Structures are given as structure tokens and as C-alpha cells.
């Protein structure tokens, strides 16, 4: 399984766009959700230099066919999703086949529900390490789609999905290191806080246990 290159992460952290243009497509596909968000959503800088950089990012993205899935994900009404997630959390206290056959809002709901379930499991435990078999973070074929939806959910629901709690949650799934790495790659300013949270919550090693 392929991780995000240090060269690509350095390019993304500095937002140096000609560097992102000179990148291989498998490496670029890992950074796809964020780059789509910076290319399509309304710019916050509103500066001419950033407008030109946004244009180059759009040019670099135009050749990728996988962008259309992320555009479909970004079209979902996130108000209803946030309301549903909050109500489900208040209520609290094949799955991969359903994810595949699901349209964008339904599959967003599926993976968000699984994430919140893992977060509740983490919060309930005092530190004991569990392993939640999810079948969606485990399937090699669907890792790209699940990762894209995860990045879009973290970006569009930041209050409901704090980055440190996602990081603490992802350790309990099979391929969580890869998911966490590309998640941090898509929000590069979260690296220090993710590392700090991971180290702080690392209180019980149990003599280098699982």
C-alpha cells in the first residue's frame, strides 16, 4: 500500500502549486479531496496570486477522472447530515456492498456512522485498546473511496469530527495508519496537533503491546 510522499506533503503544506503539478498521478490521487475543495469552493484569500494558483490547480485536476466522485460528494446537503448525526449521537447515549451501491449522501452517512461508533467506543474505554472490524477500512479496493469520503467529512464537518479524535479513532481499524497519514496530508496544518494528541493519549503501552 502506497503512502503520501514527503515531497508531496511538503508541496501541500507550503501550497506550492507548480510542485503539485510535477507529481505522479497515484501520488496526486491521495491529495485529491483537499485539492478539489481548494479548486471548486469559494476562495477565502480573494487575492489575485491565489486566484492564479487556483487556476493552475484546476488545470492539474481537469485531467483526473476520479475528481467527479469528489464533486458528487461535495454536492451533498451537509446540514441534514449534521442534524442526522447529532440526533443519532443523542439517541446512542454486506456493509461494504451497501457502501458501493449507495449514492453520495447515503455512503457519507454510512462511513460517518461507523466513525462515530468508533469514537464512542474510544470515549467509553479508559485506554484499553480494541479492534473494530469495519469491512470498509479493510477492503483494498474501496480504500481510495473511503479515504476520499473521510477527508470530505473531516473538512465539511470539523466541529463534529475533530482531527485529534479521528486520529485516536483510526488507530483501532486495520489500515488506520494509511488513513491517518493521508488525512493529515489533506489538512497539512494538523500535523503537530495530531502528533501531540497521539503522544498524549499514549499512556499505556503494556510493555509494547498491540
Amino acid at each position: 500500500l502506497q503512502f503520501v510522499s514527503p515531497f508531496a506533503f511538503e508541496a501541500m503544506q507550503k501550497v506550492d502549486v507548480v510542485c503539485l503539478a510535477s507529481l505522479s498521478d497515484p501520488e496526486l490521487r491521495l491529495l485529491l479531496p483537499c485539492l478539489v475543495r481548494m479548486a471548486l469552493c469559494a476562495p477565502a484569500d480573494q487575492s489575485q496570486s491565489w486566484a492564479q494558483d487556483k487556476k493552475l490547480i484546476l488545470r492539474l485536476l481537469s485531467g483526473v477522472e476520479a475528481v467527479n466522485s469528489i464533486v458528487a460528494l461535495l454536492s451533498v446537503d451537509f446540514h441534514a447530515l449534521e442534524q442526522d448525526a447529532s440526533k443519532e449521537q443523542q439517541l446512542r447515549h454486506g456493509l461494504t456492498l451497501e457502501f458501493e451501491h449507495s449514492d453520495s449522501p447515503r455512503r457519507l452517512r454510512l462511513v460517518l456512522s461507523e466513525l462515530l461508533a468508533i469514537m464512542n467506543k474510544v470515549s467509553e474505554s479508559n485506554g484499553e485498546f480494541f479492534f473494530k472490524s469495519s469491512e470498509l477500512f479493510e477492503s483494498p479496493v474501496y480504500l481510495e473511496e473511503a479515504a476520499d469520503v473521510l477527508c470530505i467529512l473531516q473538512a465539511e464537518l470539523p466541529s463534529l469530527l475533530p482531527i485529534v479524535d479521528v486520529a485516536e479513532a483510526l488507530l483501532h481499524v486495520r489500515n488506520g495508519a494509511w488513513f491517518l497519514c493521508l488525512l493529515v496530508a489533506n489538512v497539512p496544518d494538523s500535523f503537530n496537533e495530531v502528533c501531540r494528541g497521539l503522544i498524549k493519549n499514549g499512556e499505556r503501552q503494556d510493555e509494547e503491546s498491540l
Binding site: 487556476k55 488545470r59 481537469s62 485531467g63 475528481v67 467527479n68 479496493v141 474501496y142 473511496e145
Partner: protein, 631 residues
């Protein structure tokens, strides 16, 4: 050297002061075991020192068998009034076994039992003892009830003792409970699952147990019906089958029946430690009693199936049982079935060469050909591994039942569902960064099966969505919509390198050069079917073959053009063609601005980006867009 225990040392003063109740004595005996980890006592204030607990734990994990237990057993046997239960010893042994797995070693005694009171404990646990508070009527036998804790604790420890040391203790289980042999078979299968891979004998295990269970349940209900009137006369409490307390606290002693499947939650936690322990090695030695060690059953099924003595009935039933698992929603079930099928049966697709080379050589392959084809067709919609789906497609391409129209239509519909619905699988199989030989074989298989299907249909409406096709050359055909969408998707993927005849034939029949398209009409309503929807049209636009692009861009209404330009992944040539058509539409219809174009700035930047890529056209659209607002 000691002859007494910690319970006796505590009871020396406890019972002397005042004779405690049996429950209090049992609780004291259970607490006196001291099977907990002493290292956990210094996790709060770091007191007592931990420098010695670590050294003591390693030597404490491996312990010998003392004569104190034997002395206590002898005392209990000689005195009828001695209140000493083996439940505390069983709980201590279970706790020690559970703790020892983390620090287990070859030179460490994982378990050691010094008392032969297992038979006495079993006899005393199944018997009924009159309670102090509850007094039953004289001469009337009360129901057989046991404490939940004792029943739950006696099962795991006894099972572990019987399985780990089946030499002497295993003899008792080898003549009473066949479930011990079934669990040994499961252990030899290296999979703690119900049903196990080694428990494939349905005629002996599943059938007899199912036949006996209905009779046993009926007999139990009949026996309990007489006692229900007397029980209700005293309590006057309602009884319901779904809310029956006795069902979850008592169970009929029926060892001959099928084993109980554990819940998925316990199994998920167990699987994490199952690979860590690696308990499959211990089961290879056990062969007495034999349930039907997995290698022996493997060879037995091999000569029953591969050899000339193979029979239709048993082989067909085994294959049906074995292949209905592939359609399940559990990845573990289908993976185990796949591995077992490869092992029973047995340089490209080496892990799947069994299905391509071993299966056709069977004497009764033709008898079972239809059912395995149906099972694979059902498994296509469930399977997620691209290699497994590749093997299934290749098999369902060489060994294709053609004679029945119904079967061929259903097979085409299933493969079409694979091609259309399973978009991620299709993209993964023919990802453009790596055209593999397996990809070439699968693509050739798909075009071959679809070409034969369309040809056979041509040579000649069960479903509502059937469409009555018409060609410009004079041929008639009735087909589903999904199969047409599927061949269109195959043609977008480009020609194979191994073969081009089938690809070119399909492209010619479906989209002949400079000829009218095969207009499609519904069978029932006889109205013009939308054989090329927007998503499919956009899919063929991104294809690198010019014929699909040309067929897709015909008479495009401007809203569709505006939708297509906004899409991503369009090559430069297709983008230039799209912009040329957009310019023609703008020159012929300036009124596309009002009720189609939601925003001007983003589309202007889009057109600028298309020009920056090196795509011609769009100048009139760019001018019209910049006239509304500056870029």
C-alpha cells in the same frame, strides 16, 4: 509439601468463631484462590515496589502440581459433610490459563491438574441439591436447574483440558460427546467457526442433528406442559417463548446435537488472539475419536470426488453447500470456501489455476456445470477481490451454458450488473496505469461472451425493462437496457492487445460507420428508449477511441454540453470537440445563458483552463461569457 489450602487457613478461625452459611463459605473459597496479577497492585501509588513482582511472575506462571489438592479431595471423599467445591479450583485454573498465554513458553507449565476429581465434580454438578430456602414436595422430582455461573465456568475449563490433553482425559470425551470430535475437527481446520471446514459431513452431522432437534424440543415442551400448570398455580406469572428466562439459563443435555454458533461480537474479539496463539498445531495429533487431522478428511474427500468412484448425489450436495457460501455477505466465509475448494481440487492466475485447469477434468463436471455457474453468477455481485472476479469471469466465458435462452439472458444480465453497478471494481480491473495480461484476458472474455450473446439473440420479454431493438440493416433483437449499457462500457475501455476481432465486431454492430444508430424502443410502450443516458454519454466521451466520442456528441442539446464541459477527466481531443460543438451551439443559439448557465465566473475560468491545456474551440462561448462579467 503443604497439605492444606488458603481456604482452609482462612476457615481455621472463620468457621471456629461462627459456622458460616454455604454461600459465604463458597464465596470465601473463591476469593481465597488469589489468581489475580500482583503487578496490578502498584499502578496507583507505585507501592509495593515493582522490581521483584516482575521476577516473581515469570516463576509463578509455571507451577507444579501440589499434593494439597489431593489431600483436600481425599478429605472431601472421606467426609460427607465436607463443604469443598471444585468450582473455585476450576476458576483458578481458568484464570491461570488465561493469564499464561501472554508469557507462555515451551519450558513453562501452561496447565497442570493434580486432582482426579473431574468425574466426582461432574457427578455432583449434574445432581440436584435441596436448597435451604426452597423445599420441594416429598416424592416429587423437581426440575433440573443449575447456576448460570457454574455451568458457564465448567464448560471452557473442561473443554480446554480435554482438547489440550486428549490422552487420558480425552478418552471420556471420546465415548460420550461427539461434539468433542467436532471441535477437534474445527481446531484441525485452524478456524474456530460454526460450521467448520472439517465439519462438511452434512448427511451425518447436519441432517441427523436437525432431525433430532425438532423431536427433542417437542419432547421438552410436552414434559414442561404438565409442570407449567403447577408452576403457574403458585407464581401466577405470565410465560412467553421469546421472554423465557429458563431458555437462557438452562439447556437440555444433548451432546449429539449440533454445536452452538457464537455471536459475531465474541468472534470478532476472539479472532484477534486466535492468530496470536496459533492453536492449530495441537489438533494435528488428535485422531481418536475421529469425527469423520484435516489432511485425512482432505484425502478422503479427494478420492471420493476426484476418483472414478465419484457419485452424482453426494458430490452435487457438497458442491451446493460449498458454493452457496460464496454468495454470503461475509468475506471470511467466501475466503475460507475459496481456500478449501483450491485445496480439495489441487502459470497465470496461479492461485486461481484450479478453477481453470482442474475443474474441467472431472468425470462429472457436466452434471455440476450449471449449479456452479449460477453460484459464481450470484457471487459476482458479492465478491470484492478483483482477481477472484477475474477468475469467475474467465470461467463464465469458457464454460458458458449457451443452449437455454433464459440462462444466457440471466448470465448476460449478471455480467452487465457487474459492468455497470460495480464501477469501482471495473475501474480497478482496467486502471489505465497498469494494463496487465490478466486485464487483457478478462477484457477478451467479456467481449467474447457479449458478442456470442448478441449474435445468438440476433439469430433468433420476461422483464419489464426489456427493450425492442431495431437496426438500420434489418435485424431484430429483444434485450435489457443494462446489457446495452454494459457493452458500451466495454467499448469505452479500448481494444485489447491480445485480440481485436471481437472488439471491432462489437463496435461495428453497435456503432457502424456513417450509419444510423440502433434506435431502441420499449417492448410494452413502444416509445424511444434512452439507450445512451447522460452518465453513459459522458463515460464514452472520456474514452480514447474516436468512434465512441463521435457517436456520443451527435445532436447534443446545450444543457448536456454544459454539463459535460464541467466534468473532469476529459482528454484534450474530446475537450476540443466539445468546445467546437459549444461554439456551434452558441452561434446557432445564444439563449443558452439564461436557464442553463448558473454562474459565469467559474465556467469562464473552466474555458480558460481548457484553452491552457491545449484545447481548441470555445472562442464564441468565451466571448459570450466574458460579455456578462469580466474574468
Amino acid at each position: 509439601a503443604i497439605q492444606r489450602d488458603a481456604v482452609w487457613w482462612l476457615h481455621t478461625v472463620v468457621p471456629s468463631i461462627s459456622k458460616l452459611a454455604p454461600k459465604d463459605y463458597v464465596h470465601c473459597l473463591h476469593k481465597v484462590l488469589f489468581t489475580e496479577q500482583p503487578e496490578t497492585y502498584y499502578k496507583w501509588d507505585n507501592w509495593p515496589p515493582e522490581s521483584d513482582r516482575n521476577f516473581f511472575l515469570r516463576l509463578c506462571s509455571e507451577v507444579p502440581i501440589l499434593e494439597d489438592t489431593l489431600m483436600r479431595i481425599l478429605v472431601i471423599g472421606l467426609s460427607r459433610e465436607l463443604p469443598l467445591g471444585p468450582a473455585d479450583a476450576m476458576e483458578l485454573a481458568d484464570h491461570l490459563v488465561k493469564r499464561a498465554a501472554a508469557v507462555q513458553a515451551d519450558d513453562v507449565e501452561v496447565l497442570k491438574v493434580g486432582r482426579t476429581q473431574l468425574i466426582d465434580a461432574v457427578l455432583n454438578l449434574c445432581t440436584y441439591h435441596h436448597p435451604e430456602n426452597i423445599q420441594l414436595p416429598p416424592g416429587y422430582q423437581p426440575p433440573n436447574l443449575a447456576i448460570s455461573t457454574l455451568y458457564w465456568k465448567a464448560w471452557p475449563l473442561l473443554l480446554v483440558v480435554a482438547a489440550f490433553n486428549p490422552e487420558n482425559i480425552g478418552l471420556a470425551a471420546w465415548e460420550e460427546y461427539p461434539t468433542l470430535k467436532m471441535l477437534m475437527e474445527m481446531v484441525m481446520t485452524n478456524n474456530y467457526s460454526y460450521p467448520p471446514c472439517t465439519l462438511t459431513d452434512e448427511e451425518t452431522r447436519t441432517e441427523m442433528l436437525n432431525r433430532e432437534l425438532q423431536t427433542a424440543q417437542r419432547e421438552k415442551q410436552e414434559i414442561l406442559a404438565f409442570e407449567g400448570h403447577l408452576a403457574a398455580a403458585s407464581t401466577k406469572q405470565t410465560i412467553t417463548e421469546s421472554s423465557s428466562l429458563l431458555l437462557s439459563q438452562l439447556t437440555s443435555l444433548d451432546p449429539q446435537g449440533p454445536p452452538r454458533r457464537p455471536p459475531p461480537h465474541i468472534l470478532d474479539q476472539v479472532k484477534s488472539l486466535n492468530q496470536s496463539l496459533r492453536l492449530g498445531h495441537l489438533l494435528c495429533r488428535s485422531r481418536n475419536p475421529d469425527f469423520l487431522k484435516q489432511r485425512q478428511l482432505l484425502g478422503r474427500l479427494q478420492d471420493l470426488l476426484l476418483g472414478p468412484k465419484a457419485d452424482e448425489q453426494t458430490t452435487c450436495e457438497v458442491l451446493d453447500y460449498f458454493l452457496r457460501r460464496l454468495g454470503s455477505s461475509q468475506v471470511a466465509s467466501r475466503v475460507l470456501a475459496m481456500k478449501g475448494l483450491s485445496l480439495v481440487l489441487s502459470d497465470v492466475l496461479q492461485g486461481y489455476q484450479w478453477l481453470l485447469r482442474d475443474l474441467p477434468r472431472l468425470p462429472l463436471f457436466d452434471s455440476v456445470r450449471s449449479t456452479t455457474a449460477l453460484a459464481l453468477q450470484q457471487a459476482i455481485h458479492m465478491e470484492t477481490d478483483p482477481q477472484t472476479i477475474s477468475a469467475y469471469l474467465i470461467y463464465l466465458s469458457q464454460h458458458t451454458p449457451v443452449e437455454e435462452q433464459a440462462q444466457h439472458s440471466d448470465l448476460a444480465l449478471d455480467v452487465a450488473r457487474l459492468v455497470v453497478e460495480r464501477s469501482t471494481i471495473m475501474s480497478h480491473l482496467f486502471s489505465k496505469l497498469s494494463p496487465s495480461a490478466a486485464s487483457d484476458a478478462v477484457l477478451s472474455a467479456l467481449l467474447s461472451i457479449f458478442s456470442r450473446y448478441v449474435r445468438r439473440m440476433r439469430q433468433s420479454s420476461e422483464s419489464q425493462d426489456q427493450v425492442f431493438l431495431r437496426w438500420s440493416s434489418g435485424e431484430t433483437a429483444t434485450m435489457h437496457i443494462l446489457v446495452v449499457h454494459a457493452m458500451v462500457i466495454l467499448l469505452t475501455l479500448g481494444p485489447p492487445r491480445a485480440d481485436d476481432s471481437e472488439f471491432q465486431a462489437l463496435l461495428d454492430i453497435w456503432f457502424p460507420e456513417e450509419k444510423p444508430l440502433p434506435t431502441a424502443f420499449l417492448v410494452d410502450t413502444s416509445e424511444e428508449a434512452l439507450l445512451l443516458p447522460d452518465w453513459l454519454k459522458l463515460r464514452m466521451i472520456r474514452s480514447e477511441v474516436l468512434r465512441l466520442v463521435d457517436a456520443a456528441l451527435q445532436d447534443l442539446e446545450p444543457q448536456q454540453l454544459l454539463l459535460f464541459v464541467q466534468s473532469f477527466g476529459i482528454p484534450v481531443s474530446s475537450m476540443s470537440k466539445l468546445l467546437q460543438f459549444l461554439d456551434q451551439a452558441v452561434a446557432h443559439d445564444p439563449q443558452t445563458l439564461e436557464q442553463n448557465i448558473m454562474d459565469k465566473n467559474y465556467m469562464a475560468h473552466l474555458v480558460e483552463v481548457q484553452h491552457e491545456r491545449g484545447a481548441s474551440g470555445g472562442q464564441t462561448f468565451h466571448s459570450l461569457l466574458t460579455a456578462s462579467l469580466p474574468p
